[PDB]
Design a protein around this nucleic acid. Structure first.
Ligand SMILES: O=P(O)(O)O[C@H]1[C@H](OP(=O)(O)O)[C@H](OP(=O)(O)O)[C@H](OP(=O)(O)O)[C@@H](OP(=O)(O)O)[C@H]1OP(=O)(O)O
Lengths: 138, 176, 36, 56, 73, 123, 218, 161
RNA sequence: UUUCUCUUCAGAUCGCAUAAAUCUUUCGCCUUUUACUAAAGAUUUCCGUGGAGAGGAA
RNA sequence: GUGCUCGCUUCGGCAGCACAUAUACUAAAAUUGGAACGAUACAGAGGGCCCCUGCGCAAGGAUGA
RNA sequence: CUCCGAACGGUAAGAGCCUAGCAUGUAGA
């Protein structure tokens, strides 16, 4: 979502345009999507999926692939395209991949504040059913 | 009963399913002589019969708010909420006029602005006549091009307020 | 000033009396019982 | 004035009577007439037959 | 020149200064200029004595202070 | 009159098509008019050129309240229309300002048993 | 005007005692700790439109809980009747106190927000914007109908009307001599901010008193 | 980010989208803790930099989007900004003859403007009255004067975030 | 080095200005009240602010 | 899923190591029935409790033991 | 010489007929 930044972009911005705007179009489609069909909060799963995809892409470009410069790894977050605190959460060894909070224990929030996929793969998903009210991160 | 269509409705995100019209004018449509007949139920088919038998295109007249059967039938189709295929069939109908007019109107009030342009642009070539009732009861012969010009460019071409369709410049900068 | 309240109380009492008179021998009380 | 046969009532006005059978309890007892949205071909036939009968 | 009180018991006690031999369309223009509603939507009543948009003001013979129950179309 | 209808269908199509392009260029014309006024304000003339009209939508041709004629507010809700109903010079006595309000004994603001305010611009 | 401004200034200078109390009680600091709040970075016009829509939704749900199906706010927060309720209904809709005031406040707020929306949506876009804001504070002085719920407004409204001519005789001096000086809201907006900051608790109390009457009993 | 907008998708319905269960305190806190009219009366976007950020605490059901942000405009920079604006407004009042600023009621009598600017909002003229400064005398007050937060990446003129 | 959490002490124009309410007195009103007017004193509420543990990111 | 065993032993993998450990007024649903002092026809006035408007235990208006 | 106010004190009470936006989400076999 490109609105304005009161300045010019960095040098390596042209490479980001197509994939970034494809993901932004997916987000705009999921934002104006219909409510009929979403049970209670099913409409709020794919928005988290898209945000996760955007953070994944900008993080892979930041220093995982070492392609994006140091300006883009702060300017892309300086303007609104990804989350800095979320990537800081990814810096931990345990916080590999999960949503904001959909299967966490009693964190600062009464329901949870850790992650959607925070539950274990070896003991969670009681019996057989895996799901998450906030993001559905099975 | 005049609450919903049958049991459920994809709520138009603008204001509400039925309340896209002002509540005053809606309540006037209910308390009306024409609402007695044809309000027993009109889903998809009988709407076509009740539509072609009223050759007016107008809103409110009289000192009291006097709704035309044009406006009341627009509201009836609004409560019915037909599918887009029927509305597209009415939009592409050249023989009957006011059916196409109602298709355009409901598409303006029920539809994305992209589809609004896509289905209202080819209505910019009918130089034919259209009958419309002024607020003082007196009629006037108006061209259809003037009608769509007041619809898209102008606000409240009828008594209804329109839900702020975008400017063409932004869409031209972004899309078709 | 209190005369207004006194007249209002008198009018309320008279209205209650008239309502009781119309209801006691009402069509649903007297005339309805006239058929029984 | 106006008097219904199945509704078993009488309305002493015109507009007041018009707002009676359109959603009456006895009218409901006669049958549920909820507007069922017909198929897309329904409007097609409603247009074709009416153009063939009224016009033609 | 006349002062009229376009009144209502719903947060609209408006005081419009109408002309002597003026119509009511201009009076509705003033009522919208002081009330904040579209011109053609305003309605003026006094126990269902709906004043119309062509009957003049001196025709009914309104004078200073004649309040009018305001309603909307 | 089909030959006349198609002739006017272009008459309306030309005006409607002219309004579109006239609206697009107006954004540049407004910026260009500021640029023309920019150089006009810069090096046109030191108090030797106006090229203007001081145009206002509705001229409030006020008068002089007699002694305590109420401060009537026109209501600033609709003024872009430039309706002629506004140009009437609301400086007249409405209900009770017809009097002189000087022959009175000392003063009379309002005897309606509500004189919370106290002011008459003496100071 | 300057006399009234100096009067307010000196009366403010008098009632100035060192405040040291309240034990540092802060709001919007413990809400986020619970699951009844979430922080976000949303554009200002978006937040304003959201607040206006939320206020209209709240008032509409209030009027709908009362089963009054013959009233309408119209999104300018001008409560509009429908069919001349005069049998026993006009005695049922005599709010007078808080509905009137909340209506006036949300009307002012939504009006400012929609003005800036038209700015972003292709308004005059020039100094005409700030001129409009100056006229909007004049209208809050006069146009916005907040008199009935509170008559103490006239103090700050005379303050704003004096602040008006405090500027034009400092702005409309020289070439600009008659025309509408667009001015600024450096003082108007300031006064209304202080006003709302001081009067938040009154409406908190009135809603605490009213919501129990419309939701619990009497 | 966009959770708010989908949380606004419900404006009132018959248990369609969080209507029934999310109604009672959705009304209660909506009418009890307004506390946003003040913030909007205290978080003007500073029109010389009208691209404001406005962080917003929002109830989950969508009752109110409360603003937690507070303005901390630096006094002398603030006064210099509004003085430059004073000069430019005098200039625009002197030069222009016809002055259209009378759009008094917006929203068009029950036309909610929530469209095309509660969105991607392609239009963004944030260059309203930004005075063109010649970096010959106004150099040191140049790159930290048309930004509403001229302290973030300073580390010398700002104690912190 | 930078921030968020909070129990805690403020008589620094705690905030180079400035909101309201409650109570007690004194005026103007007054048809009853609520809304009121302009002066004094005190107690609270809200926009806040200052200085000191402990616990969480770069 | 992440990083690693001078692991089995390849760079295919096999086994192990440590981080991460329990959200869910569960259901997009189901059925369930009522109230205008509201329009219309009709005659056309000699002590507290239960309710409504309401911010004040300000004030105001009201049938039902 | 520009200071501009709102609510209550207000619409008799009545018997016959009629129409409706709203609300529960469960215990248990
Ligand atoms: O008509 P005047 O007695 O000369 O005073 C007017 C009047 O203000 P006041 O009536 O309160 O003194 C205008 O206010 P409004 O009538 O619009 O409410 C105001 O105009 P603005 O609203 O734009 O501020 C401004 O008039 P102007 O715009 O020409 O400056 C002002 O003083 P002047 O008319 O003497 O200039």
């Amino acid at each position: 979502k490109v609105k304005r930044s009161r300045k010019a972009p960095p040098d390596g911005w042209e490479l980001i345009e197509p994939t970034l705007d494809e993901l932004d179009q997916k987000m705009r489609e999921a934002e104006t999507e219909p409510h009929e069909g979403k049970r209670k909060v099913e409409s709020l799963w794919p928005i988290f999926r898209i945000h996760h995809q955007k953070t994944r892409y900008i993080f892979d470009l930041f220093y995982k692939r070492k392609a994006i410069s140091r300006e883009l790894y702060e300017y892309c977050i300086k303007e609104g395209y990804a989350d800095k605190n979320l990537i800081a959460k990814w810096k931990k060894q345990g916080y590999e991949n999960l949503c904001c909070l959909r299967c966490i224990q009693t964190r600062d929030t009464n329901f949870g504040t850790n992650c959607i996929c925070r539950v274990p793969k070896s003991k969670l998903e009681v019996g057989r059913i895996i799901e998450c009210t906030h993001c559905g991160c099975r | 009963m005049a609450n919903r269509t049958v049991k459920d409705a994809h709520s138009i995100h603008g204001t509400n399913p039925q309340y896209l019209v002002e509540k005053i004018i809606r309540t006037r449509i209910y308390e009306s002589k024409y609402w007695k007949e044809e309000c027993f139920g009109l889903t998809a088919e009988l709407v076509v019969d009740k539509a072609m038998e009223l050759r007016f295109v107008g809103g409110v007249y009289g000192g009291n708010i006097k709704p035309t059967p044009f406006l009341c039938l627009t509201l009836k189709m609004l409560q019915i909420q037909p599918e887009k295929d029927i509305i597209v069939e009415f939009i592409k109908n050249e023989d009957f006029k006011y059916v196409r007019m109602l298709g355009a109107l409901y598409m303006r009030l029920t539809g994305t602005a992209i589809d609004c342009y896509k289905y209202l642009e080819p209505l910019y070539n009918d130089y034919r006549k259209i009958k419309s009732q002024n607020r003082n009861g007196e009629f006037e012969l108006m061209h259809v091009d003037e009608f769509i010009d007041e619809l898209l460019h102008s606000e409240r071409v009828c008594d209804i307020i329109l839900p702020r369709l975008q400017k063409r410049y932004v869409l031209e900068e972004a899309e078709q | 000033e209190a005369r207004k309240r006194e007249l209002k109380k008198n009018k309320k009492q008279r209205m209650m009396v008239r309502a009781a008179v119309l209801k006691m021998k009402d069509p649903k009380q007297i005339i309805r019982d006239m058929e029984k | 004035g106006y008097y219904c046969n199945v509704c078993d009532c009488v309305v002493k006005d015109s507009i007041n009577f018009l707002d009676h059978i359109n959603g009456k309890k006895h009218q409901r007892n006669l049958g549920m007439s909820m507007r069922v949205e017909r198929s897309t071909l329904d409007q097609v036939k409603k247009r074709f037959e009416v153009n063939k009968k009224k016009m033609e | 020149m006349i002062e009229v009180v376009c009144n209502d018991r719903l947060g609209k006690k408006v005081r419009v200064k109408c002309n002597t031999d003026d119509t009511i369309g201009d009076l509705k223009k003033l009522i919208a200029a002081q009330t904040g509603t579209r011109w053609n939507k305003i309605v003026l009543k006094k126990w269902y004595t709906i004043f119309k948009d062509h009957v003049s003001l001196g025709d009914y013979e309104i004078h200073d202070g004649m309040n009018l129950e305001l309603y909307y179309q | 009159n089909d030959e006349e209808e198609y002739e006017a269908w272009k008459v309306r199509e030309l005006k409607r098509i002219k309004r579109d392009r006239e609206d697009r260029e107006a954004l540049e014309k407004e910026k260009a008019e500021i640029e023309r006024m920019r150089n006009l304000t810069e090096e046109e003339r030191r108090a030797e050129l106006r090229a203007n009209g001081k145009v206002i939508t509705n001229k409030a041709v006020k008068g002089k309240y007699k002694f305590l004629q109420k401060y009537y507010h026109r209501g600033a809700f609709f003024m872009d229309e430039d309706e002629e109903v506004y140009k009437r010079d609301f400086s007249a006595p409405t209900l009770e300002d017809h009097f002189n309000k000087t022959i009175l004994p000392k003063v009379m603001q309002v005897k309606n048993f509500g004189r919370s305010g106290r002011t008459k611009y003496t100071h | 005007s300057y006399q009234k401004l100096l009067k307010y200034y000196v009366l403010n200078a008098l009632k100035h005692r060192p405040p040291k109390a309240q034990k540092k009680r802060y709001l919007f600091r413990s809400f986020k700790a619970t699951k009844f709040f979430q922080s976000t970075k949303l554009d200002w016009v978006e937040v304003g439109l959201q607040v206006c829509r939320q206020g209209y939704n709240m008032l509409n749900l209030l009027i709908h809980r009362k089963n009054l199906n013959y009233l309408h706010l119209d999104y300018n927060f001008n409560l509009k009747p429908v069919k001349t309720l005069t049998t026993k209904e006009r005695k049922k809709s005599r709010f007078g106190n808080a509905f009137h005031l909340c209506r006036e406040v949300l009307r002012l707020t939504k009006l400012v927000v929609d003005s800036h929306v038209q700015y972003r949506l292709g308004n005059v876009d020039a100094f005409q914007l700030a001129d409009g804001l100056q006229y909007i504070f004049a209208h809050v002085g006069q146009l916005t109908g907040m008199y009935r719920y509170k008559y103490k407004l006239m103090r700050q409204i005379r303050m704003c009307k004096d602040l008006k001519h405090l500027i034009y005789y400092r702005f409309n001096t020289g070439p600009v001599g008659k025309g509408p000086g667009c001015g600024f809201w450096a003082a108007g907006w300031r006064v209304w901010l202080f006003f709302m900051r001081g009067i938040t608790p009154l409406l908190e109390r009135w809603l605490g008193n009213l919501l129990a009457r419309q939701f619990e009993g009497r | 980010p966009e959770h708010v907008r989908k949380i606004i998708r419900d404006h009132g319905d018959m248990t369609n989208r969080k209507f029934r269960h999310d109604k009672r305190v959705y009304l209660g806190a909506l009418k009890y803790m307004p506390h946003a009219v003040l913030k909007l009366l205290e978080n003007m976007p500073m029109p010389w930099e009208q691209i404001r950020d406005v962080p917003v605490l929002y109830h989950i059901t969508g009752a109110i989007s409360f603003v937690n942000e507070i303005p901390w405009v630096i006094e002398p920079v603030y006064i210099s900004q509004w003085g430059s604006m004073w000069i430019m407004m005098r200039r625009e009042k002197r030069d222009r003859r016809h002055f259209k600023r009378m759009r008094f009621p917006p929203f068009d009598d029950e036309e909610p403007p929530l469209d095309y600017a509660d969105n991607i909002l392609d239009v963004e003229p944030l260059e309203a009255i930004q005075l063109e400064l010649d970096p010959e005398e106004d150099a040191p007050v140049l790159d930290w004067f048309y930004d509403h937060q001229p302290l973030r990446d300073s580390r010398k003129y700002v104690n912190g975030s």
